[PDB]
């Protein structure tokens, strides 16, 4: 109950610990994880890719072999709705953030579905996310945050955003190549001491002074509190953590909850996927059934991303990620394809969110 961390200001909204749980998808950071996360004081942030997962496709117009039919449906409005209204019946009012990533055609429709559910935070990467305020300005309130890989990035985005719209983003997020899900980084960059974490915050904080400030969010590979006070005294304003979470009762995704306290260091590792961006994920699942020449057949039904184009990149790299993931969300081990942060291997224990965040924020 005693913290000496402080309260964090993201745009007009306040959290009182420093601290994001990183949205993961599909059907990780949902309502159980998203409302308890926020309940506790932290930022909870609810992952508005493949919804139309949701509880066995409830909120689906049409299927095709049992999967989302195209990305109305896999972006699904009504379960996003659902998921909001009961991540606050554990939270209220407590600041919640949607996560949408953007390299995807329909971004706008699925930016204003998470402000039409009561989002008060966007964060969006997988992109250089210039347009953001286009679609967000009927709801003046929402925070908009892009994740960067670089200072650079930072600069463009407030140069962007400003020239366009007379506004800058409310926070950034600087995610590092230990970080669970997909990667800002090539695949040789993510092993290079010039991107490590703690070499990135601070030129992100020292190109954020140009802009006033914003505060800077560091992610990817932060375990512990230990971690926190050393990205803070970077000059970071807060941390976006996710394995951790990965790693809690609440998670959405109930699988993980069986699978992270056998995972071992060796069974993590960088894979090519259609989003275009290397992804960290683990050795089992559709990855092993691959390599048995058991491969799940590809044929695009919820056209999740734009860069795969319906399938092409999907049939080279191997695998359809859209498939895997909501294969995964819906309890398959022997299909299903599954995401971890460089630490993985550390968790032991699945624990509560509640006693995750005392551990993070205690003295
Ligand atoms: C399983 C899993 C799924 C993820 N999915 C997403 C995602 O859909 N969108 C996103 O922006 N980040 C995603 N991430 C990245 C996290 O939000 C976070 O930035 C990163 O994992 C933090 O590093 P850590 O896991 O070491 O704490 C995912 C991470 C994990 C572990
Ligand atoms: C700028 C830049 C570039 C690359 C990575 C970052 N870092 S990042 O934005 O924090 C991210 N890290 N992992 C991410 N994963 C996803 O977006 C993702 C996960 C699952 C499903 C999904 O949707 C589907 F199925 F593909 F349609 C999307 S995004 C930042
Ligand atoms: S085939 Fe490609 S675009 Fe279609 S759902 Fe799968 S990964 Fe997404």
């Given at each position: 109950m005693v913290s000496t961390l402080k309260p964090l200001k993201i745009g007009k909204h306040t959290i009182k610990f420093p601290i994001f749980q990183g949205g993961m998808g599909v059907?990780?950071?949902?309502?159980?994880?998203?409302?308890?996360?926020?309940?506790?004081?932290?930022?909870?942030?609810?992952?508005?890719?493949?919804?139309?997962?949701?509880?066995?496709?409830?909120?689906?117009?049409?299927?095709?072999?049992?999967?989302?039919?195209?990305?109305?449906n896999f972006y699904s409005k009504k379960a996003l709705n659902e998921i909001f209204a009961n991540a606050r019946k554990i939270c209220g009012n407590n600041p919640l953030g949607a996560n949408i990533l953007y390299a995807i055609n329909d971004y706008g429709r699925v930016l204003r579905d998470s402000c039409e559910a009561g989002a008060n935070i966007i964060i969006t990467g997988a992109g250089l996310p210039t347009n953001m305020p286009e679609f967000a300005k009927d709801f003046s309130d929402v925070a908009?945050?892009?994740?960067?890989?670089?200072?650079?990035?930072?600069?463009?985005?407030?140069?962007?955003?400003?020239?366009?719209?007379?506004?800058?983003?409310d926070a950034f997020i600087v995610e590092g190549p230990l970080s669970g899900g997909h990667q800002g980084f090539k695949y040789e960059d993510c092993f290079k001491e010039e991107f490590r974490l703690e070499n990135?915050?601070?030129?992100?904080?020292?190109?954020?002074?140009?802009?006033?400030?914003?505060?800077?969010?560091?992610?990817?590979?932060?375990?512990?509190?230990?971690?926190?006070?050393?990205?803070?005294?970077?000059?970071?304003?807060?941390?976006?953590?996710?394995?951790?979470?990965?790693?809690?009762?609440?998670?959405?995704?109930?699988?993980?909850?069986?699978?992270?306290?056998?995972?071992?260091?060796?069974?993590?590792?960088?894979?090519?996927?259609?989003?275009?961006?290397?992804?960290?994920?683990?050795?089992?699942?559709?990855?092993?059934?691959?390599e048995e020449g058991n491969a799940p057949k590809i044929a695009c039904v919820s056209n999740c991303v734009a860069p795969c184009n319906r399938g092409e990149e999907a049939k080279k790299v191997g695998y359809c990620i859209a498939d895997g993931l909501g294969r995964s969300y819906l309890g398959n081990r022997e299909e299903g394809l599954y995401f971890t942060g460089a630490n993985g291997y550390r968790v032991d224990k699945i624990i509560s969110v509640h006693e995750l965040i005392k551990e993070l924020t205690e003295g």
């Open positions: 059907g990780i950071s949902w309502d159980e994880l998203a409302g308890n996360v926020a309940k506790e004081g932290a930022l909870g942030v609810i992952s508005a890719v493949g919804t139309g997962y949701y509880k066995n496709m409830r909120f689906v117009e049409r299927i095709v072999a049992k999967k989302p039919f195209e990305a109305l908009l945050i892009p994740i960067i890989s670089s200072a650079k990035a930072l600069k463009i985005l407030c140069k962007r955003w400003s020239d366009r719209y007379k506004r800058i983003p990135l915050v601070p030129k992100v904080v020292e190109a954020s002074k140009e802009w006033g400030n914003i505060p800077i969010i560091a992610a990817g590979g932060i375990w512990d509190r230990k971690d926190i006070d050393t990205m803070l005294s970077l000059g970071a304003s807060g941390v976006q953590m996710a394995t951790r979470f990965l790693g809690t009762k609440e998670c959405d995704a109930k699988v993980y909850a069986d699978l992270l306290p056998t995972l071992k260091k060796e069974d993590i590792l960088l894979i090519k996927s259609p989003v275009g961006y290397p992804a960290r994920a683990i050795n089992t699942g559709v990855i092993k059934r691959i």
